[PDB]
Specification:
The structure is a homotetramer. By secondary structure, chain A is mainly alpha-helical. Chain A has one domain: Ribonucleotide Reductase, subunit A (Orthogonal Bundle), CATH 1.10.620. The first copy, chain A, contains 18 helices and two strands. In chain A, strands 1-2 form a two-stranded antiparallel sheet. At the A-C interface, helix 3 and helix 4 of A face helix 3 and helix 4 of C. The complex binds 2'-deoxyadenosine 5'-triphosphate (8 copies), magnesium ion (MG) (4 copies) and manganese (II) ion (MN) (8 copies). One manganese (II) ion binds next to helix 14 of chain C. Chain D: This is ribonucleoside-diphosphate reductase. Chain D: Keywords: ATP-binding, Metal-binding, Nucleotide-binding, Oxidoreductase. Chain D: It is an enzyme of class 1 (oxidoreductase).
């Protein structure tokens, strides 16, 4: 009575669909007739009937029906039709496969409609800094935070602005190498969120009087070693080779988007969760974290589409490079944290707790692709930042 | 005496003789020929000649460049000939370095070379909308049962015409930073690019809910649409060119004619329909929001063209102005034919083709005039006044 | 009774039944259905059906593909249906992988995919020439105290027209390996590129010694030349394109019309002069040497197009074929105008424009026919016969 | 004043009318002054030049000294506007006369670097095909005439040459993309075709010597993998879109790859024929390849010196330490290739010590050619043993 289609949907069983598929294979070779096709269809039907005998819960698949058609054509006089059927079916199956790097003729239907959720995610998360009030935050600096706390916040703000207050064009340019309408939609939507993040942190540098301090940040050794791993990771961002460009997406989504700013997002939101201070800045950092989580997630999905389509590319040589880069990302981010707390650590958020938080983020990134974790974790120290992931 | 000076930016400032002395002293120090005492002597000569021009002849304010020309003249009249020559060369080199090039990348993020362009990001953030904010329930009812066959055919054709531009992959603005590598331009491009994602989603939804998906796939086979695709593709011929001059022609025709005129006859039809018949409420709200964002898109293009013209005036000769004028006529011919096709089953009493055609002719003239070019069409101000309400709702 | 087999490379080899047995056993091993014993039984059936063909043919020799079709047929007739299906798919997959793609890079240097293309390197090594090998002394004497004003104007214009193409930077052949990344194509590219340096140096020297350097700088302003530059640039529109189908149009128009027809009216004019008037002995020698090298250049391009057509037949539709025929006519119109300009001061009695025009029309038809297209020009066989000596000199 | 030094440093007869006309043209351009005024200014320039000659040090004026003098007299005169316009026009003409190797140009002629045309003439002169040589004697020398030690050394030397030569080589043929000059395009295309000839020659030698199978397996040898590593590192930026990165590739390629990588192997084959009077055919082919490799590296040295002269800022201590670092890595790997060639034993007439000094010296000459200091200490006695090699080339 029913059939499971290729898209896993159920549809009413129509024997004429089997008859016509056989008749078309027959017509293509000039061997057989509508009468012969009807006979073969019945043989296929009688066989399906016998499968409902072994199991009452059985409903045939389109691929099970196809395998059966082929088997009956091999058992018949129409061997040339059987061979042509096998080849034709296999050719259509190969044509139905997707290539993320290849352009398509038609706009609709989408090849990866699940990616449309990323446009909806950013439209939901959409924010402008002008929606927040930084008045309490300015006062927290004037008459509520200690020299040690104010140095840590200043350094954290500067570290976020290093990445955020810049020209960011990776997502906006992703459609040049992944030429899909659904990816272009995501790319454009993410590019604009990067304009909003720039405007937020550029405003915060202004109102906090950190503009001069920001221009001189590039000359700091800790920042130069950070710029070095960031630029190394984006080495192939403009490459014409699809495998080289995949390395850029990988390191960018997994480590840049998902770990580079989160030691800093943690610090600002720690001050707020703990002391109920930095209200406006915390709101802006939380909204950034939410959009950064969406950015990294899309990258993880893109990598998994690439891996599924080109599994050969993901060998031991590739996996050792990712693990090499992951460690260099950690060592550089750990030294950024050391610089943030140059004037002293915070009793409520020590460097040890921040370092476990980073190590874990890097492991989750590795695990998201299908790689084994790189760091051993102190579960007790990690539990101290469980509140962060509950809020994002 | 001399109390004021006109600066390079044409602003006025109090006259300070030490500024002339220091400029001369620095030229002298660079060569090791002359002293502050000699510089002071030359400054006075410059000052005395500046007075001879003022109260003595026409009651003027000297310019920084008139001062510079005078410094050079006194240096040549003095013993410091090597200083005179070095001053001439340094001044000219500083003049060249001071120029902005929209096509060249700059070293530092701040200061911005074109900070006026930042207003376009603010404009789109203000005009920002998603179709999910509107309710198209009444519109679906109007279209399926509430419209006459003449009205329905016109609306269907208008919707299809908007969708052949809007329901497509649009990456021009998102890619503008490749040839115009400025942070402030990159910000505008990204914001405009996302606005096109929203425009696509809106008209794609409208094709779905109005049951026009099948008529949309078959639209490409229509002669009027093929003729439209032809001028649109001709206009974007150099959109991916590596020559800055060729690429400028693409920005020009795209901003001035594609962004400012191609969809506006259709935008006018939907607006006039709601205005007179109080129908197509949701679609009207969506068309109005698209019109506002298209006006912003074309405006940015106009500004970009005027920056390019100011920096490369040689590129904008009579041969290139005749090409724009010709393409403007081809854009009008094709859009006028689109309007004829929209009203194939009959014209609307409240909005005749004659009123639509004057509205288009005027939009094309404003585009030409916005770029310092001569108007192309002669306008009947009476037929044009019938669509004045449209420019009220967009501004 | 079956002693030989035709292999895939069309070579004949002794028939070995164990080769059939092992192919069946590998398909059987891959699925875990059957045994070596079952494979030998299927082999015997295959051998038996091959003999039935020998009964009907005569000295029937099976091909590897006929043996393959037979293996499949016996597997379908047997209990091993899964093995028959897997054999069909594997054989077909292996055949698809064996196909060549001119635009794709290969892993190994040897074996060559197109070894016939190596002949072009040998062809140029044979035709290789430097202008310094010829003597232009008699030519300088002819060009002053030997030619009439009509003859001298024609020669100067012919030389200038040749130089319009030859005295320039030519990098198409040298850059062909970027889009057709084959070692054998890279060899031809480099060899053809150097020949262009030799062609440039030749015509640049002739402009110097004939005192045509000033006339050459002001040739670009001539309407006939601007019209020529227009079709030449249109033809090379996609020469640096990143799309393989667009780039193929550039190779096509370039090899077929630019290389094989653009300079040939001029080559014919100079040759005619040495043949009939017995003059310009040095210049005729260089022109003949260039003609032979241009014929080699266009020929390689024709071979490249035929490889592309064989591999992507879908690309060569009616829309494509109408563009080639459109461009072929524009090439002819522009070249016919060039001939009119060469003879602005008067035609030559031994070589009239009508004879030159039939010569061109025919060259364009041969180009079209070389890539399997229809002959586009109406030919006066009598007027054409007047220049058959040229082709009987390349 | 009888003669003047021109911009190209050539001497020419002094003509005062050349000064008069330059002044008159500056005057004519503004409509300020006359030929009479130009003549007066010319004389002032002449008189001041005369003051530096007969009266001072028997000097010869240069075009730029005459130009500075013209400007000085114009500044001393009433024509301050033409004095200024002269200064600007002279400086504009001087800026236009500057060359940028990375930039295109409107006109084919005149050439910016006409000295580079000599490289096309050099290759046309050195042009050869392997079909011109007779390898009959060589084939038998290899099968039956060589000892086990000698045979192994020749086989390894041939395989080492072929590692570089039997391959697709497109660097020179692609140089015009980043150095877009007609004169560079001419050398590049000429050099690219010579590499096709080199490929055909060593591919034929692998065939006739029965080394095709040993060649396919050569890639798996640790010494060869180590060699491929420095060669690929050196050509890291060969396809880069940055002019400074691409310059590093040209540098390492011309100086070390072209001028040194194959020269130990070229020396082995030459020395063998010289001493043993065997491998006459192969020696002829090797000598012809050595001659064309010397031309290839020389053009590269000239290109680097043009780049250095135009962008001196690029050649700092950080850059120079990288070249010296890469030069040592090239030497280490090449010396390892020498050890592998003689794995079955050294040659009495050509020991590894003599080959190693020969290499060290070649690397020093490369460094010195682009104005860098040497790196290796040389044993002049061991080096003298290979002076015949440089005489042959
Ligand atoms: N509803 C059905 N009832 C019975 N057999 C079916 C049905 N749908 C598909 N099949 C089987 C018959 C053939 O063996 C095979 C392919 O048939 P076909 O008519 O092309 O449908 P389909 O599943 O490929 O979808 P589509 O209509 O989009 O091509 O699947
Ligand atoms: N020309 C033919 N030669 C051989 N078999 C054929 C031919 N035409 C149809 N068939 C058979 C084999 C196919 O699996 C079956 C259904 O046909 P068809 O709908 O065209 O393809 P399909 O179901 O395999 O894939 P798809 O739905 O992606 O088009 O009919
Ligand atoms: N206020 C002034 N009073 C008199 N002369 C002035 C004044 N400002 C500028 N000048 C003249 C003096 C010199 O000839 C020439 C350049 O002087 P300078 O001190 O560099 O100022 P400026 O106009 O270039 O501004 P800036 O501070 O941006 O360099 O302009
Ligand atoms: N090093 C120098 N050599 C020669 N002339 C000099 C030098 N320094 C200063 N001068 C002269 C010429 C300059 O036009 C003038 C003012 O100097 P400066 O402010 O540095 O340049 P400027 O006003 O022309 O341009 P800008 O202010 O835009 O950099 O003084
Ligand atoms: N000499 C032969 N005698 C009989 N059958 C043969 C012979 N050579 C090939 N075949 C048939 C047997 C199989 O059906 C089919 C493929 O067999 P196979 O052993 O792979 O040889 P081949 O022709 O593909 O060459 P290769 O050894 O390079 O793979 O061809
Ligand atoms: N793994 C297998 N699954 C199914 N059939 C197989 C398998 N291995 C061998 N065969 C069958 C089908 C092949 O055509 C035949 C000969 O095998 P094979 O030499 O590997 O391929 P082939 O001769 O078709 O192509 P080629 O020689 O070019 O690789 O044996
Ligand atoms: N032979 C000469 N005798 C005297 N002055 C000369 C001579 N040649 C050049 N000069 C001086 C005069 C002017 O100041 C300056 C430029 O003069 P000019 O006539 O343009 O010659 P040149 O050196 O630039 O060569 P060219 O003829 O190629 O332009 O050089
Ligand atoms: N139009 C002019 N305006 C100002 N000075 C001029 C003009 N024409 C000639 N002169 C002066 C300045 C020049 O240096 C000099 C010689 O003229 P010219 O040969 O044209 O340039 P040049 O010798 O400096 O460079 P070049 O040889 O590269 O052309 O005469
Ligand atoms: Mg189907
Ligand atoms: Mg200044
Ligand atoms: Mg096989
Ligand atoms: Mg001159
Ligand atoms: Mn961000
Ligand atoms: Mn981000
Ligand atoms: Mn839009
Ligand atoms: Mn728009
Ligand atoms: Mn040629
Ligand atoms: Mn040619
Ligand atoms: Mn070589
Ligand atoms: Mn070389």
């Amino acid at each position: 009575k029913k059939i499971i289609k290729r898209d896993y949907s159920t549809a009413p069983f129509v024997l004429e669909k089997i008859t016509n598929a056989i008749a078309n294979a027959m017509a293509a070779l000039g061997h057989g007739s509508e009468q012969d096709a009807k006979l073969i269809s019945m043989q296929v039907y009688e066989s399906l009937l016998n499968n409902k005998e072994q199991e009452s819960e059985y409903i045939p698949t389109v691929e099970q029906v196809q395998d059966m058609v082929e088997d009956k054509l091999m058992s018949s006089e129409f061997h040339d039709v059987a061979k042509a059927y096998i080849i034709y079916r296999n050719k259509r199956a190969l044509e139905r496969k997707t290539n993320i790097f290849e352009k398509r003729i038609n706009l609709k239907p989408y090849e990866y409609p699940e990616l449309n959720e990323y446009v909806a995610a950013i439209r939901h998360s959409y924010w402008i800094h002008t929606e927040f009030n930084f008045t309490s935050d300015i006062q927290d600096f004037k008459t509520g935070l200690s020299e040690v706390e104010r140095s840590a916040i200043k350094n954290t703000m500067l570290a976020i602005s290093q990445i955020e207050v810049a020209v960011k064009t990776f997502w906006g340019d992703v459609h040049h190498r992944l030429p899909k309408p659904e990816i272009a939609a995501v790319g454009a939507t993410f590019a604009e969120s990067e304009v909003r993040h720039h405007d937020a942190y550029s405003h915060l540098l202004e109102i906090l009087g950190l503009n001069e301090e920001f221009k001189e940040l590039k000359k700091k050794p800790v920042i130069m070693k950070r710029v070095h791993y960031l630029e190394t990771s984006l080495k192939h961002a403009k490459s014409d080779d699809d495998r080289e460009y995949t390395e850029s997406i990988l390191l960018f989504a997994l480590f840049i988007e998902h770990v580079s700013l989160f030691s800093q997002f943690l610090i600002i939101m720690a001050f707020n969760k703990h002391k109920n201070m930095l209200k406006g800045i915390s709101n802006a950092v939380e909204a950034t974290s939410k959009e950064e989580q969406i950015h990294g997630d899309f990258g993880v999905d893109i990598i998994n589409i690439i891996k599924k389509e080109n599994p050969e590319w993901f060998d031991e040589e590739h996996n050792n490079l990712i693990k090499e880069m992951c460690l260099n990302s950690f060592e550089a981010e750990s030294k950024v944290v050391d610089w943030i707390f140059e004037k002293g650590e915070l009793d409520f958020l020590p460097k040890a707790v921040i370092n476990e938080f980073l190590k874990n983020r890097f492991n989750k990134s590795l695990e998201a692709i299908g790689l084994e974790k790189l760091f051993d974790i102190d579960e007790a120290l990690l539990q101290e930042t469980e509140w962060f992931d509950d809020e994002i």
